[PDB]
Design a binder for this molecule. Structure first.
Ligand code: ZN
Ligand code: ZN
Ligand code: ZN
Ligand code: ZN
Lengths: 89, 85
DNA sequence: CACGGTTCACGAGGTTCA
DNA sequence: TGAACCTCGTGAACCGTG
């Protein structure tokens, strides 16, 4: 269906919210990288499939608000223990 | 395509507008200095690739008249925090 | 299939130096 | 001023396990 962050074509659930592939990734990177973003405008930017790269603060706050969750992102160790298991197959 | 300010060949989007490399820089430099310009002639020079730099006031105007947003310029703070790594 | 991650080409922000 | 260059954030493709 539709991405709950930017409106774009969703591709399924990601981190617990219906989203597109861009926002799936923006959300994982942003949380892992612990980025802190700051809106250049008013803090209530209207996110769309085309302007979403313009306000990260608003995009990120939106992800969290529609329900996306960091706890679903793997930790480095979980990834490692996981690379080890695919590389043991 | 073509630069929305001078007609030069644009290099991609810049501050949210299709623009050449020079107008890109001119915009960012002006805004980072708040630089206010005045125009030596009337107040509507026709900006071209050639003259382009003879009227700062009219150019910066046209820049804004086509979308370029000073908000997309990195803040002294962000330009810094980031300037570390 | 669903949904975690990884790969890699590409856009757009800033910087250098003539 | 602006050509040329350095960076890294993006997202389309794609891999792998549950
Ligand atoms: Zn989205
Ligand atoms: Zn915003
Ligand atoms: Zn131009
Ligand atoms: Zn003028």
């Amino acid at each position: 269906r539709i991405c709950g962050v930017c409106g774009d074509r969703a591709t399924g659930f990601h981190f617990n919210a219906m989203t597109c592939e861009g926002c799936k990734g923006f959300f994982r990177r942003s949380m892992k990288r612990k980025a802190l973003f700051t809106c250049p405008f008013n803090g209530d930017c209207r996110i769309t499939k085309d302007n979403r790269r313009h306000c990260q603060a608003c995009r990120l706050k939106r992800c969290v608000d529609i329900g996306m969750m960091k706890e679903f992102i793997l930790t480095d160790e979980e990834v490692q223990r996981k690379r080890e298991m695919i590389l043991k197959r």
